[model samples]
Target: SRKKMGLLVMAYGTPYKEEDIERYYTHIRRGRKPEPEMLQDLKDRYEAIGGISPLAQITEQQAHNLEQHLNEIQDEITFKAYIGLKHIEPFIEDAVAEMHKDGITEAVSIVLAPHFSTFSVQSYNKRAKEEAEKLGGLTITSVESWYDEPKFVTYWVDRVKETYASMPEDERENAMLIVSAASLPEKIKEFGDPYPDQLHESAKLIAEGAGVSEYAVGWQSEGNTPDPWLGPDVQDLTRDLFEQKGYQAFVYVPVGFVADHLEVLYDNDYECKVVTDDIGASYYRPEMPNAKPEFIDALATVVLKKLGR
Candidate 1:
């Protein structure tokens, strides 16, 4: 009998339409409903980004591309890719249950986010494990972190160089590459989490590969909470950098994030751009690696490594 393997690719999902805003936010808060105004606040954000976030569509393509790439590279096992969203419909539990139903006894799980965090990437694995336990027969080997994945770095390096070249020749010399990622609580360092450091490492690698020396590290898209979030926040950093550098433009590289989500589309593209615009500075970000061949291959190689050994 041919061996079958389920490939689970999970991500933070988004509402596909205006009607989904409330239900999606409610699920994210673990079933605690948001105030009516809070719901509208979210809808407003979605509206500003052209009525929907491309996260769900991007993630689906990533999973599909990985599946196609894996099938092309090997035949020892039949690979089927399933997308699991942490919040919203067709959840992690739903994906695992479907895997069991398909008669795949063992599978590999990978989160779309490359970095590992006890409170972040591990949460995806934890959910998968909990669901697998309930099902009893399914087993999941979680690809804990792919930040170190080689092709991932190469992809960014090439993109950075390409985007840099796109700038007018005179603007290229002094432009800064503000390498950034999402901000978690400031308290994450207390647990010795490597999330922030991982972002820095990715930044350094990409900057070096692209021959960029003037880049600074920054964070974006922090949640509103009583506790402090991580910093060198992007908006202020962009504004001040322009002033310090005497109006040199910036090329932002969201090294920690891999897809085009709210954080990318709105937080950086709109919010940060507005900050730079107000300061009379230029800000640029390369397109996300959603379903790109290099990115898909990086993920496929990771799972292939696990299966090979």
Candidate 2:
């Protein structure tokens, strides 16, 4: 007997236009009203990057890449892979509907983010469960998080080491790496959003792999909120490094993020780099981990394991 299982990949969606900015931000805000000025700042960030994020495109590419990888497997299992964004077209609910239409009765839903907290990962699971319950009879299993996956850690280490080695020898002397911090981690520690911690851990391994030491980590592009998020912010760190400590070169690595979205394109590449350059320091940013083949293959393996295929 043969069974068809659905592998649905989900990710946090970003807005592509000013009109969609508030809607996207509101969801991220989680019922808090973003101040008028704060919302405007978000709009400006999106606008600076053509009012659209390549997140959707990246997710689709990963999904397709995973599909191809799985098809190459020798297993008898049949799978229908679908890509969906949390708050955009081809959304979670729509993807579930399509899965139903495509004759998939068993489903494995996974969020692309490697790390999670109750709020971040739970939100996706809650939404998926709600949608699945309404659809009836489909055995839906949602992956909570895969933050510490060896393959994920190893790939990140390789990528960071590769990026570091590519820096000019002079630049490498006083170079520091900065990673984006997860907002949810600071809120609850035990279920710690390991985005930053695991990233640092992997960085340590990568540093050892490269035989270097003396690096610093800083949170970046964090939302301006009354409540505390991750701190010693990237901009502040950059200023301190250049003006105060006299570090001349910074090789920033946004290890928490994986694609060329607003965070990478606008925040680190543009804003933070500007701050460093203005302070007379040579600033360089590593490229985003776009749906790189090995990384995509790692994602495919996680999906298969979740589906028990």
Candidate 3:
């Protein structure tokens, strides 16, 4: 029996419960527990999203779906898909060890994130590399980023376009699109990162595909990073759109993120909704494409293309 090369999908894992926040954040920061206020804030966010995130499960499905798609199209090479989480259960090191035990001597690595930045995709890559060294003798090639993959772009384009297209005909006309970036652009810029640029590219592609000429990009989900983040913040944009521009309809799109995590559910869905309502405008947040067939297929395509299949 011949074994196929392995594929490892990596991600930023989330807390599994409300009580898990302190520990999860602490784990992320090398065992330094967040200050009381910060911990409370994180807990509240998780509480708002039902004290759990389906992020881990969603990524697992994406990895499995990717494997299935590859199997369907390529030779029955021994392909085993493993998931590595940067912050939670089945951590990167553990996932790598599991793959090695399963006889995976070579891997084509892919991060669940589409965009690449030093602070983002690199986290997963660095951890996977460290763990692979411990395993020793495992050959690895990581897919750095697929922010501009044609199929990925098309999937996002269609997702955003369809979201806007679903709005009532009258509301669709002159609807203001608010694109949400997980962090502010200025923050990434200060760190010499490309998150902001990649975010803008995502927005531009989606807007263009949707035929949305009028749109604004805003920063959201500020954590306790003790630094200024990208802004013209979502709330500010909401006020400006309603007060100055008199826009009546808004289609809120979370660009930098694909999954409906605490940020999307609480920050954008509930908190942002309140602000938009206060501004006297109808705000409709676009749904996340979690495990959407096309999006999953696009992810698979990214992996295959990376493997040169």
lDDT for each candidate structure: 0.84, 0.70, 0.77
Please give the range of 10 consecutive residues that has the lowest summed lDDT in model 1: 49-58
Q: What is the C-alpha RMSD of each candidate to the true structure, in Å?
A: 1.7, 3.1, 2.6
Worst 10 residues of 2 by lDDT: 177-186
Candidate 1 lDDT, tens digit per residue, 1-309? 447889998888877778887888787676788898888887887788776746568788889989888888777877899889977778889999999998888899888887778777888889898899988888989987777778888899999999888888777986888888888888878888988888888888889889988788999988777888889899888887777676557888887777888888898999988987787767898998887888888888888887764
In terms of lDDT, the poorest run of 10 residues in model 3 is 181-190
Residue-level lDDT of model 2, residues 223-254, one tens digit each, is 55666776677888788766665776776767
Model 3, span 1-309: residue lDDT tens: 544788888877776656778888898677788999988887777666766756557777878877877777667465788888888878888989898898788898888777777776876788788888877878778987786877777776776687777778777785798877666325456577777778778778777877889888887876556666667778788787778777778888886676778778887888888987887667788677677878777777787787776
For model 3 the TM-score comes to: 0.89
Clashing residue pairs in candidate 3 (N, C-alpha, C atoms within 3 angstroms): 4-78, 184-230, 185-230
> How many pairs collide in each candidate, listed in order?
0, 0, 3
Between the candidate structures 1 and 2, which one is better when assessed by TM-score? 1
Highest TM-score against the true fold, candidate: 1
Clashing pairs in 2: none
Native-to-model Cα distance after best TM-score fit, residue 142 in candidate 1, in Å: 0.7
